[PDB]
């Protein structure tokens, strides 16, 4: 069992999997 508790800043992106293109890319660090 792994733990991914994203309660501190992270980088995220939405990838179009067939082409591997990044559609959106961000950092969430300030609620």
């Amino acid at each position: 069992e792994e733990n991914f508790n994203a309660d501190h800043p992270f980088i995220f992106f939405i990838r179009h999997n067939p082409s591997a293109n990044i559609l959106f890319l961000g950092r969430f660090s300030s609620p």
Binding site: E2, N3, H8, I11, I22, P31
Partner: protein
């Protein structure tokens, strides 16, 4: 799609690095594909050292048949009958009384699907502004309702090139609203703010990047043609956000190695993820100039004679607005980029 996605991803990484230089701790949210699309349409009409600068910084010079590959990419992204909403649209707004080269217009229409709308920038730039904004608002399901604010276009504007991208997909594995609880989000080593933290435990593609002390998670959307990938440091272990080492070594090459499907394994994961919503605005002009795109924005040096046969135009601004709403059901994300072209 090989060469084009590598190019687009290399630019995505360069532009994220530039934005991080101006703001190393705030939220950042962009659509790299939206920006690359607006610049690919501008690149069609550039010549000379203007073109050379754009293709180097955007990596278009590493792609054989760049515009044909984009045409194929647009066809795939906009395919009908998908189990999610995904729209990538391009459009040209030209001054009624202005003369454009046929080849420039035919190519933007064939390769990018951009049709030409004729507006009155010269006599009625406010009506023209509101027409552009209404179109982007319509493309983004209301999420980008005013891409261009007063003063972004005036009676000297000749062309505005616009890309809008919209996505709304359900998670493959949704979170249950009832498991969402208030929990503390640590901004840095000692500030805390309360967030709605969603929770579920499911098998997801996963990896711990041993040498970076970082976890990678992939959360598929319905259909599995798009995923969200999240990179999370093991803890905040620096004097700001915790991401400094990752951002330090973010390259096309490392991003690829960290998040490649081949490098993720299915694991049973406890996922705690905040429910969140971002709306961001960028004037990309200076960041792009810092990246090497210089003549394009310079009234005296810009060569856009591919658009009208003369060196009488230049790009005053490239602006980008974005939006993401992430919750238990899925994600709704939108962005739009406008390049405003004025008489030099």
């Amino acid at each position: 799609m090989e060469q084009l996605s590598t190019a687009n991803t290399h630019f995505a990484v360069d532009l994220f690095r530039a934005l991080n230089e101006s703001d190393p701790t705030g939220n950042i949210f962009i659509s790299p594909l939206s920006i690359s699309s607006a610049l690919a349409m501008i690149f069609l009409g550039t010549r000379g050292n203007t073109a050379a600068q754009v293709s180097k910084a955007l990596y278009f010079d590493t792609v054989e048949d760049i515009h044909s590959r984009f045409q194929s990419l647009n066809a795939d992204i906009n395919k009908p009958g998908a189990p999610y909403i995904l729209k990538l649209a391009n459009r040209l707004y030209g001054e009624k009384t202005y003369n454009f080269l046929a080849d420039f217009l035919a190519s933007t229409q064939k390769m990018y699907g951009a049709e030409l709308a004729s507006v009155d920038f010269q006599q009625a730039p406010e009506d023209a502004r509101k027409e552009i904004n209404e179109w982007v608002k319509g493309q983004t399901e209301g999420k980008i309702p005013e891409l261009l604010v007063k003063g972004m276009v005036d009676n000297m504007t000749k062309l505005v090139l616009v890309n809008a991208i919209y996505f709304k997909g359900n998670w493959q594995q949704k979170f249950m609203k009832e498991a969402t609880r208030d929990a503390p989000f640590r901004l840095n080593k000692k500030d805390t703010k309360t967030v709605k933290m969603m929770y579920q435990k499911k098998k997801f593609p996963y990896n711990y990047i041993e040498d970076l002390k970082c976890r990678v998670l992939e959360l598929p959307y319905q259909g599995k043609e798009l995923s969200m990938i999240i990179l999370l440091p093991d803890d905040i272990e620096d004097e700001s956000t915790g991401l400094e080492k990752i951002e330090k070594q973010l390259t096309l090459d490392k991003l690829r190695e960290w998040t490649k499907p081949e490098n993720l394994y299915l694991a049973e994961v406890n996922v705690h993820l905040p429910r969140f919503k971002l709306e961001e605005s960028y004037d990309l002009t200076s960041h792009l100039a810092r990246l090497g795109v210089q003549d394009l924005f310079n009234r005296g040096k810009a060569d856009l004679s591919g658009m009208s046969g003369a060196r009488d135009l230049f790009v005053s601004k490239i602006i980008h607005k974005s939006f993401v709403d992430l919750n238990e059901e899925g994600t709704e994300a939108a962005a739009a980029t406008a390049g405003t072209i004025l008489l030099a």
